[PDB]
Design a protein around this ligand. Sequence first.
Ligand SMILES: Cc1ccc(C(=O)Nc2ccc(CN3CCN(C)CC3)c(C(F)(F)F)c2)cc1C#Cc1cnc2cccnn12
Length: 259
Amino acid sequence: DAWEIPRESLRLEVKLGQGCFGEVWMGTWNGTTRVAIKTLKPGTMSPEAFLQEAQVMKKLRHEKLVQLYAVVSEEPIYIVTEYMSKGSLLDFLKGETGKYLRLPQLVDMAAQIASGMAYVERMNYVHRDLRAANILVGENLVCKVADFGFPIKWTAPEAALYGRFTIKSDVWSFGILLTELTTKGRVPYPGMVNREVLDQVERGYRMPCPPECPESLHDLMCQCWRKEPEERPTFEYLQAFLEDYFTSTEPQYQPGENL
Ligand SMILES: Cc1ccc(C(=O)Nc2ccc(CN3CCN(C)CC3)c(C(F)(F)F)c2)cc1C#Cc1cnc2cccnn12
């Protein structure tokens, strides 16, 4: 058991999520420390399929990966975790302060995610659904990699077509996630339906450079979007590249209207 707790500890205060097969609540733990809860909506998935997520989350422990705190085996099940106060990043980028973000805050932000995924990469694990809807945000623009568990527009074409879901198909996704950041949360492949994406991309189409995104950064995304998984960069290299960007790659970056 080890991470099992009682319902006596917890209190589910305001419903923040409304998942495929569950819900998500702000709360309080042992009446003191403020946490988040995944509640299985009963019948649907059962304590087998749902509770392999707590297995996986037990082994990972990293400063950019949402931290498991506790579990509740006896039904209804509450999977418990730290609370990211600004929520999902897609929400944050679309919300109040999205308009004030410039490219040093987005690229800093990006480097934290790459950090988390490098740790994921080190453990020989695949995420499978890397994107702005699976990144939570707390104060001071701290981002962490989360999971809320199909998206053609984020999934690599070798994983979408043939199921080769490797670390390097998360590398692909990271490049797309980068375009979300640089457009402020806009959906990939504007106007193009799932079917058009595959076909065009399959035939070499990549997203053009976002307006006011320098070309150096657009060369990074295309690096993630190479046709051969093994020629994609790595999260470590991407981490460093993003960390060093304004000294080593854009020292004449000058902020403008949007970025
Ligand atoms: C309550 C809660 C419960 C569970 C999870 C969760 O499922 N996390 C998770 C699951 C799996 C994986 C890794 N696998 C990927 C798949 N892969 C195939 C295998 C490995 C990881 C990761 F950390 F590794 F990324 C995280 C997140 C939250 C949240 C929250 C929260 C906190 N503040 C707010 C504010 C607004 C909204 N939500 N929220």
